[PDB]
């Protein structure tokens, strides 16, 4: 049985906390995490207009694509806690936050209002005065699986192959737009030979930030694509220099104008939540050749969506970013006023049910609440480490 939040809930408040990076960690070419010197894993954006003019083929190398199987690539709470231990150890203290979770989780919530057909299924878990929130993985995988089989069964073999190559365009773009070190420390041939480099999606640089909304405090782990220019030593300045990289088809008609608006909004959700101030889009034609690249400043995106004449639509259907924010804040304040964070015996389920227009918080089963507390979310080491701070 459930508590539910009217989908028309909107905070009035939106006092906004300035995001700040706490630490980072990484994943390597084989899937393994890395807690020491993760900065060695941070690439740097490098893609001069002159080179774009060469007409880079974003499907070069498709065949050799080194791709992590989906099950291995679910947002991993184990490594993150493991990462979190290291940093709290050093601080001599635990992170002040009302919530701790991956940021894709919050992106979905923040973007829900204009993505009303997309389910959301997550677990919520009280522990040490804080809420821990991971995604119902089982469910997720089973959808990706069944969505996969639809796409295969309802399309021609060529249309399916093309969709698969589009998925690769994203990684390939990241590969030919970044360099592993800054410009000063990299050779001219390391630069000119990126287009041959074998593409993988194993390697990741992950940042854990502290942020907040109204009077609630959040910690978000999320992936960062690269650094814009350089990475300052100064802690509270690092987020200002990351870039998100995306790619999109060139825009031909009005139908694509709105499709692009909706992508751009999603991306603004992700980056706003993370404090990433820069979004680059590489626009590629139907032969998956890169045509031009355009940088957006995150904080300007709301203004561009509001003022597009082509996409003036119905108030309830028009993307407004503030209105989503007011929704977001109304969500987290609900999570923050509904669960006794201190009561660490039961867990919950966040469900958004698209068919039933329901946003439900409901207590989980008892085995449920167990396995989350014993290895599925919380780990022996983290649980242990966290208690020993009062002892």
Author numbering: 1 to 391
The authors write:
Rai1 homologs share several highly conserved sequence motifs, and our structural studies show that they are located in the active site region, mediating the binding of the divalent metal ions and/or the RNA. We have found substantial variations in the activity profiles of the Rai1 homologs, and discovered that some of them possess a new 5′ triphosphonucleotide hydrolase (TPH) activity. The overall structures of CaRai1, AgRai1 and SsRai1 are similar to those of SpRai1 (16), KlDxo1 (18), and MmDXO.
There are essentially no conformational changes in CaRai1 upon RNA binding, with rms distance of 0.38 Å for the Cα atoms of the two structures. The CaRai1 and SsRai1 structures are especially similar, consistent with the 58% sequence identity between them. The αC helix is absent in AgRai1 but contains more than four turns in CaRai1 and SsRai1, which also have a longer αD helix.
